[PDB]
Structure 1
């Protein structure tokens, strides 16, 4: 059945990490390239998507007086960007320059939009290919578990001890060879139930 293939999950989780890396590099480029026009923004607004949206609404600092950033930013932050716009140390840019920077920012929000779509799609795949696992550990940790082993079957043939320390091999074998205590959480540390526990109960 098309709805019970695990090769989609292993690729989706790999794709999702690839998107996060590429979306981050473009965000830095926009913060650097647009930072020439107005370098104080990066310190005020840290979110890459929110940073990109400000450029789309107002391409130039002069526009900051009239442009409204309410839908992007809270009240106290949106006024900080307005004050900084006038007293900025940056240089003016041509409309030819502005056209390509807006194009880059559009790619930020479009990539951010698709990243949210892929996150939902991975949840849908996980709730159909391994519904029982998702009910217990969750979609994100569940998908990470499956991808680490390489297949759903390869994970099924593993004892629960390995599933406990599945993502901590660097620490595990270092400890085993050096007569030291071994890790006790691995990749399951980010499961919701583990977080609810406290102290030594996390290990249990």
Structure 2
């Protein structure tokens, strides 16, 4: 959409710079496709409401960056000891699945792993099978930093320490509000992670 406000017609295409939008290889590439392309010409009445979708696309994405900014304010409002650990988006969704913050901290640690993956869980218990091991916690920034089966072993240590961080956030009437427990929680997982990546199954 940002191209349409810059590119316009195919002869406006070759002349106008795309340094700001997709540069240095694709700018040459859209210049190449500009001269030979199977599409038609478009009138200046038809370049009015593609010329006003290019506004309304951009104003959505410019609103969404204000919108994820709004949760990052609300993470550090409600549970900042949580969102120093797992990030704004997971903690937006772990609260969203349970409901209130108080309802989430009353759950134990091991049910904060599998808070998302409830469809594959109760299938795997009602028929005798294997429980899913990540859950909604899998899209944390830290499970992705691990590899292999170590995505499982960090998914315990997070859901333990996130359960430690949540109860300091739901159930402390005084909050230091700096993520002071949470950054002590994340440094324990990074010690757990870099221990667990140093160990390897191979033979030396």
Distance 2:33 2:119 in 1: 47
Distance 1:182 1:166 in 2: 12
Shift of 1:195: 2.1
**TM-score (normalised: structure 2):** 0.72
Give runs of aligned pairs for residues 135-174 of structure 1, distance below 5 A.
135-174=84-123
Find the residue that maps to 1:99 and give its secondary structure: coil
Give runs of aligned pairs for residues 72-151 of structure 1, distance below 5 A.
72-151=21-100
Shift of 1:136: 1.7
Point out the structure with max Rg over C-alpha.
2
Write 1 or 2 for the structure with the bigger share of helix: 1
Instruction: Please give the root-mean-square deviation of Cα atoms over the aligned residues, in Å.
Output: 1.1
Shift of 1:199: 2.5
Distance 1:185 1:151 in 2: 22
Shift of 1:144: 0.6
Distance 1:91 1:198 in 2: 50
Partner of 1:64: 13
**TM-score (normalised: structure 1):** 0.72
Distance 1:69 1:199 in 2: 41
Partner of 1:199: 148
Kindly provide the CA deviation profile for residues 71-103 of structure 1, in whole angstroms up to 9, marking residues without a partner as x: 111211011111111111001111001011110
Partner of 2:177: none
Shift of 1:150: 1.3
Partner of 2:128: 179
Find the residue that maps to 1:59 and give its secondary structure: coil
Shift of 1:197: 2.5
Distance 1:113 1:191 in 2: 24
Kindly provide the CA deviation profile for residues 124-173 of structure 1, in whole angstroms up to 9, marking residues without a partner as x: 11011111111122111011100011111111111111111000011101
Distance 1:201 1:78 in 2: 42
- Higher mean alpha-carbon deviation, 79-88 vs 187-196, is at 187-196
Shift of 1:190: 1.5
Shift of 1:110: 1.0
Find the residue that maps to 2:50 and give its secondary structure: helix
